[PDB]
């Protein structure tokens, strides 16, 4: 009976979704002028790393970056001068995520150690120091983004997300509902609700205040690797191993676009939008990064400049540049 | 021209020097991905080193070994086994006193897209009590296709053949060994294997392999 109740609820949810799907973006974007051929070139190269780079994150000042690499060094870069203004030795070199605080005062990093490390930058003593260790996850840390200088939310490899109070280090609000382990995590511009992407091919929206899932989206065929909110917070795109990215809308509560092309047979590592939200930048396994016109799913250009897998991707808050790290141990900043 | 930011440039160069020194020190170490099933013998192996992920380390005969034991993590391995690409070798171990899960795992990882050219040091652990299990429990129940006697050495050889058959490429080698539940020599076996591996990598860098 209860299984039948669940099946009936799923069926009526699907029926309501079909009723709400009066059109698709493909037939409404028939009058939009495409972005054309995007020709981009590397403007900076950060070649201080010594092994694979898994994570990066720009700064809200749009000048300083943070990079996480297998070398065990979390080095803050000067994107204009190429100076390495800071260099943090990690307690564990198995790092796949990093975060730069919106104020720039703090920086977060984590990985297979199940711990999100919060490092204080504006230290009175002059050296970068760990402020507190975020522990409690039973799975590996996959992504983490700051709400402010005190609140951070961390994705994990145990199908759960957690929102942290850095002052106490406890789990202010824990998140459950994914059936597979979670790979990505991104925050809305209003910072009132976020989404997470898990290997169960499902991306779902959560409330930071109460932890209740607000809209669960499905449609992917394989594991979700990356998610980025649209600049308005009313949509987000997902990155998956199936060589396809898909766009989900919160109000429509259903998938809206799928970014596919037969020439790609490899998964997406990281995804992010531009400032206007027209460009969807996805890092791929085949050594290159494509640019996706989020309104038309067009492949407007290729950011092919890495000798190995491009893994991490971030875009300036000013919209000036995108930096794509890779396993080639070199970052690259583009325009 | 440059302002007093020359001091920032000097700090950047100092950071570069420190990073280069740290990397030169790090490349001196040998990275090993310890691996296997639950209770297969990874814990015993790191115990014999005499010292989420636990990166057990030890030094032996002028080499610095780091055992990256990733068996304490219950998660999909397809999302984090790539973190261990470009290690010196894999110390994958199995339990003879089990089994099909170990064979499936070895087929998945020995032929993984990241370890297709990475040597694997297969340790058939738990030899002493498997020597009693073979007498008490016929191996035919563990391997229905086993067309051979129930004597010990041939059963061990049959398990060796079943494990070694999983390789699909001619550019990788598998160093099978038996831990015999006493060890005190697996350090030497690992040392010989990683010596061959580092010599091969040196040859490849020099074009000799």
């Amino acid at each position: 009976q209860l299984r039948q109740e669940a099946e009936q609820l799923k069926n009526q949810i699907r029926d309501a979704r079909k009723a709400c799907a009066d059109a698709t973006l493909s037939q409404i974007t028939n009058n939009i002028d495409p972005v054309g051929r995007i020709q981009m070139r590397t403007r900076r190269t950060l070649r201080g790393h010594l092994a694979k780079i898994y994570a990066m994150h720009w700064g809200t000042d749009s000048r300083l970056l943070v990079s996480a690499s297998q070398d065990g060094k979390l080095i803050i870069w000067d994107s204009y001068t190429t100076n390495k203004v800071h260099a943090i030795p990690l307690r564990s070199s198995w790092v796949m995520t990093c975060a730069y605080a919106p104020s720039g005062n703090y920086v977060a990093c984590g990985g297979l150690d199940n711990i999100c490390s919060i490092y204080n930058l504006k230290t009175r003593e002059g050296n970068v120091r760990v402020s507190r260790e975020l522990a409690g996850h039973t799975g590996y840390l996959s992504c983490c983004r700051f709400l402010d200088d005190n609140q951070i939310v961390t994705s994990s490899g145990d199908t759960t997300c957690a929102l942290w109070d850095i002052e106490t280090g406890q789990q202010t609000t824990t998140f459950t509902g994914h059936t597979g382990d979670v790979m990505s995590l991104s925050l809305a511009p209003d910072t009132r609700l976020f989404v997470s992407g898990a290997c169960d091919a499902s991306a779902k929206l959560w409330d930071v205040r109460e932890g209740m899932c607000r809209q669960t989206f499905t449609g992917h065929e394989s594991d979700i690797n990356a998610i980025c909110f649209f600049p308005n917070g009313n949509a987000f795109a997902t990155g998956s191993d199936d060589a396809t990215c898909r766009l989900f809308d919160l109000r429509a509560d259903q998938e809206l676009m799928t970014y596919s092309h037969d020439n790609i047979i490899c998964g997406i590592t990281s995804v992010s939008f531009s400032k206007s939200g027209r460009l969807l930048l996805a890092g791929y396994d085949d050594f290159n990064c494509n640019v996706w016109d989020a309104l038309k799913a067009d492949r407007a250009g290729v950011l092919a400049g890495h000798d190995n897998r491009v893994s991490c991707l971030g875009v300036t808050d000013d919209g000036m540049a995108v930096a794509t790290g890779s396993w080639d141990s070199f970052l690259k900043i583009w325009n | 021209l440059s302002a007093e930011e020359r001091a920032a440039l000097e700090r950047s160069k100092a950071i570069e020097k420190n990073l280069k020194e740290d990397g030169i020190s790090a490349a001196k170490d040998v990275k090993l991905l310890l691996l296997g099933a639950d209770n297969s013998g990874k814990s015993t192996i790191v115990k014999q080193m005499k010292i989420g992920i636990v990166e057990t380390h030890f030094t032996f005969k002028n080499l610095h070994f780091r055992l990256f034991d990733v068996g304490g993590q219950r998660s999909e391995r397809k999302k984090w086994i790539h973190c261990f690409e470009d290690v010196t070798a894999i110390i994958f171990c199995v339990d003879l006193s089990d089994m099909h899960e170990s064979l499936m795992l070895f087929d998945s990882i020995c032929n993984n897209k990241f370890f297709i050219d990475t040597s694997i040091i297969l340790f058939l652990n738990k030899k002493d009590l498997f020597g009693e299990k073979i007498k008490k429990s016929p191996l035919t129940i563990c391997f229905p296709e086993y067309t051979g006697p129930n004597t010990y050495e041939d059963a061990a050889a049959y398990i060796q053949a079943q494990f070694e058959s999983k390789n699909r490429s001619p550019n990788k080698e598998i160093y099978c060994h038996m831990t015999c539940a006493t060890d005190t020599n697996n350090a030497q076996v690992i040392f010989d294997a990683v010596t061959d591996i580092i010599i091969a990598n040196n040859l490849r860098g020099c074009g000799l392999y």
Partner: single-chain antibody
Amino acid sequence: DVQLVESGGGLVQPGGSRKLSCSASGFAFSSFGMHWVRQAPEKGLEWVAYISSGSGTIYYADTVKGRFTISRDDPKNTLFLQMTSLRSEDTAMYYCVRSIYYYGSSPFDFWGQGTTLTVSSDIVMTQATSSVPVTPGESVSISCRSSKSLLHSNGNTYLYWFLQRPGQSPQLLIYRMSNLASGVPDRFSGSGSGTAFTLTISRLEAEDVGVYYCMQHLEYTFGAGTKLEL
């Protein structure tokens, strides 16, 4: 907490020589490009020495070049400034100055207690007033001028503001003329451009009584000093 205590001062016969030590504690001295500056008993501050991180870059004053030498011993966390052939113009209280240089950093963010030493194309900073009367809760504007433009082509303007309380050590208020230094109340503020500068203070208290110096950091220089009193 950060501390800088110096030693090696006292009485020196004319023509003599001695070395001054800056014992550092409470911070990672190895990555700090410490300075050493002095103040005559009835004059403004003046630049003397500068040693970079790792002892890779060093400069001295024009009246001191080839006459003194600055040394850094990082493992012992001590800064050395050996002075040779002391003259009548070298008597002063010497302040060890802490500094670290990266983007968004606060140079000159800490100063030492000081040691008295007694004997028996340059950019010049000028202050139009030496002393003005102030009242608590009022608003004042303290200004100083520079001979050369402090605004670099990259947009940064290298002007710094310091306050000298009576019987105390100078403390940084504003670095790069706009960014208020850590540990200072928001009451202070800085503004200006090109060759003219000013410091805007509102809601003054007794803690603001002192002498205000301004320093330019564009090229290898303090002002005269403006005193506030009731």
